[PDB]
Amino acid sequence: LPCVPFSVAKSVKSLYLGRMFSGTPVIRLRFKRLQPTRLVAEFDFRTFDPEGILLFAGGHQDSTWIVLALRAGRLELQLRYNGVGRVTSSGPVINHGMWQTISVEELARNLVIKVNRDAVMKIAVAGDLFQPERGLYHLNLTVGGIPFHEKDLVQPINPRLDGCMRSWNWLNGEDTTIQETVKVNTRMQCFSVTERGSFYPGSGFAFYSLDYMTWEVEVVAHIRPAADTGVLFALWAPDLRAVPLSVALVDQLVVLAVEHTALALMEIKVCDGQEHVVTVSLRDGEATLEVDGTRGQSEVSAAQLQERLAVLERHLRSPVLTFAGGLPDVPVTSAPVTAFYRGCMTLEVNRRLLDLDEAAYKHSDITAHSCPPVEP
Amino acid sequence: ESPFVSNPGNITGARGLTGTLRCQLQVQGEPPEVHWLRDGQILELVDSTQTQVPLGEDEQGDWIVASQLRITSLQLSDTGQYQCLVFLGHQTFVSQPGYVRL
Ligand SMILES: *[C@@H]1O[C@H](CO)[C@@H](O[C@@H]2O[C@H](CO)[C@@H](O)[C@H](O)[C@H]2NC(C)=O)[C@H](O)[C@H]1NC(C)=O
Numbered sequence: 001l002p003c004v005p006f007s008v009a010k011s012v013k014s015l016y017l018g019r020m021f022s023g024t025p026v027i028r029l030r031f032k033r034l035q036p037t038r039l040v041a042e043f044d045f046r047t048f049d050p051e052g053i054l055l056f057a058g059g060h061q062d063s064t065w066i067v068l069a070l071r072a073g074r075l076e077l078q079l080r081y082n083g084v085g086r087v088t089s090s091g092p093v094i095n096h097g098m099w100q101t102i103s104v105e106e107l108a109r110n111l112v113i114k115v116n117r118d119a120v121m122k123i124a125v126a127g128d129l130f131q132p133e134r135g136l137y138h139l140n141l142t143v144g145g146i147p148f149h150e151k152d153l154v155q156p157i158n159p160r161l162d163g164c165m166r167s168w169n170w171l172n173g174e175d176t177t178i179q180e181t182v183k184v185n186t187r188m189q190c191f192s193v194t195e196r197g198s199f200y201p202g203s204g205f206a207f208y209s210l211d212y213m214t215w216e217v218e219v220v221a222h223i224r225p226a227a228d229t230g231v232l233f234a235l236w237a238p239d240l241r242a243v244p245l246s247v248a249l250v251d252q253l254v255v256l257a258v259e260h261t262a263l264a265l266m267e268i269k270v271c272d273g274q275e276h277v278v279t280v281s282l283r284d285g286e287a288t289l290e291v292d293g294t295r296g297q298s299e300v301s302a303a304q305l306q307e308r309l310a311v312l313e314r315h316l317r318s319p320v321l322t323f324a325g326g327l328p329d330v331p332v333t334s335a336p337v338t339a340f341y342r343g344c345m346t347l348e349v350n351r352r353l354l355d356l357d358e359a360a361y362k363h364s365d366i367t368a369h370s371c372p373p374v375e376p
Numbered sequence: 377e378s379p380f381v382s383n384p385g386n387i388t389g390a391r392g393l394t395g396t397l398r399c400q401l402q403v404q405g406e407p408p409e410v411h412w413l414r415d416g417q418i419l420e421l422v423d424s425t426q427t428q429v430p431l432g433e434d435e436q437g438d439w440i441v442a443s444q445l446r447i448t449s450l451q452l453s454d455t456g457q458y459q460c461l462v463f464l465g466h467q468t469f470v471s472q473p474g475y476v477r478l
C-alpha cells in the first residue's frame with residue numbers, strides 16, 4: 001500500500017488529447033454545410049509538453065489542409081494549398097501549464113491564429129479549407145492528431161501531445177456530443193491539476209536505446225515518490241538477461257548497483273511528499289551517488305569497485321536497453337530492487353532530458369509530461 | 377440488434393423556425409458515416425455535423441458516432457419523417473423515426 005497518496009481528481013468538462021497511443025486523434029468531426037463556410041475554432045489549452053498536434057482541419061493528405069501544432073514550446077502552423085506545402089512557427093511560449101485561449105480562423109485571404117485574443121500568426125493563402133461539391137461544402141476536423149501518417153506532413157513531427165482542452169467551439173455549432181461522452185468516460189478527462197514531470201502509477205516502464213560509449217553513465221533524476229520501493233533507472237542487457245546497472249528506492253534508501261551488488265547507499269525521506277534530486281555518475285574507476293547535494297558512503301572496497309566497474313564496462317560493449325520506472329520481470333537475484341516505481345519523475349541521461357513521447361516503448365498509463373499533485 | 381443508442385426527436389412549428397435533430401450509435405471497428413433520411417430518401421444536401429469518438433486505445437476497438445442535422449428555416453419541403461441510417465458491412469440499420477411538420 002503506497003505511503004504517499006496522489007490526487008485522483010479529474011475535471012469533468014475537459015478533453016485529454018494524449019489518450020491514444022499513437023497520435024491518433026481523440027475526436028473526429030466531419031461537417032457538411034449548405035452555404036460557403038469559413039473555418040472558426042476556439043478552445044482553451046493547457047500543457048507542459050513542448051511538441052505535438054493540437055488539430056487538423058481540411059480535406060485529406062494530398063489536397064488542402066492546415067495542422068496547428070507545438071514544436072519547442074511554440075505554435076507551428078503547417079498548410080498544404082493545392083500541392084504546395086509550407087510551415088511557419090511563431091508567437092509566445094505555450095507549454096507553461098497555465099490555461100490560455102487559442103483561436104484559429106479563416107479571414108479573407110488569410111489564416112489568423114490568436115493566443116489570449118492576441119493575433120500571433122497571420123498567413124496569406126490562396127484557397128478555401130471547405131471543399132465545395134454539388135453546392136455541398138465539406139470539411140474534416142480532427143483533434144489531438146491527424147487523419148494520416150505523420151510521414152507525409154510538410155515537416156515531420158512527433159504528434160503525441162500530453163495536453164488538455166476545455167470550452168471548445170468548432171464552427172459555432174451547438175452540438176454537445178463531445179461534452180456528454182467525456183462526462184461518461186473518465187479516461188477522456190484530464191487531471192484537475194497538473195505539475196511538471198512524468199507520472200508512473202507503478203504498473204509499467206518505458207525503455208530507450210541509448211549509447212554510453214572509454215564510456216560514461218550520468219543520470220539526474222528528479223523525484224517525488226508515492227512508495228518506498230521501485231526502480232528509477234536501469235540498464236538491461238537482453239542476451240545475458242542481466243541488470244548491469246540500476247538506481248532504485250528500497251527499504252528508506254537509494255541504492256546504486258551493478259547487477260546484484262550495491263556500490264553506494266544514501267538515506268532519503270521518500271515518504272514526505274517532497275521533491276528530491278538523485279544523481280549518479282560513473283566512468284572508468286569512478287562511481288558516485290548523490291541525493292540533494294550529499295554523497296552516499298561506498299558500500300564496497302576499492303578492489304571490488306574496479307571488479308564491478310569492469311563488469312559494467314564489459315556489459316556496455318554489447319547492446320543494452322535503458323529502462324525508466326521499472327524492469328521487465330527479471331530474475332529476483334539480478335538486481336537489489338525489481339519493483340515498479342510509483343510517483344513523479346523526470347530523468348536526464350548523459351546530459352539529455354528524456355522525453356517519454358520518444359521512448360522505444362512507453363506503457364500507456366505513464367503520463368509523459370505531467371503529474372497530479374500530492375493528495376492533501 | 378440496433379446500434380442506435382438514441383433516435384431523432386420531433387420538430388413542430390412555424391415557417392422560419394430553426395432547430396436540430398440528432399442520433400447516436402455505438403459500433404465495433406472502423407466507424408461508419410451517418411446518412412440522414414427523409415421519407416426514405418438519403419439527403420445529399422444537408423446542414424450536418426458528424427462526431428466520431430474512439431473509446432478503446434486502438435482505432436479497431438469501439439467507437440461512438442453521432443450526427444446532428446440542422447434545419448435553418450422551416451418550410452414545407454423540410455417536412456417529413458426523419459431517420460438515420462448506417463451501413464455496417466453489407467448490413468443496414470435504420471433508427472426510430474422523428475417527425476417534422478407545421
Ligand atoms: C474527410 O475524410 C474522409 C476520410 O474519412 C475522406 O473520405 C475518404 O476518401 C478516400 C479517398 O480519398 C475514399 O477512398 C474513401 O472511401 C473515403 N471514406 C469515406 C468513409 O468517405 C473525405 O474525402 C474527407 N473529406 C473531404 C472534404 O476531403
Ligand SMILES: [Ca+2]
Pocket residue numbers: 049050051052158159160161162357
Ligand atoms: Ca509530446
Ligand SMILES: [Cl-]
Pocket residue numbers: 011012013014
Ligand atoms: Cl470541471
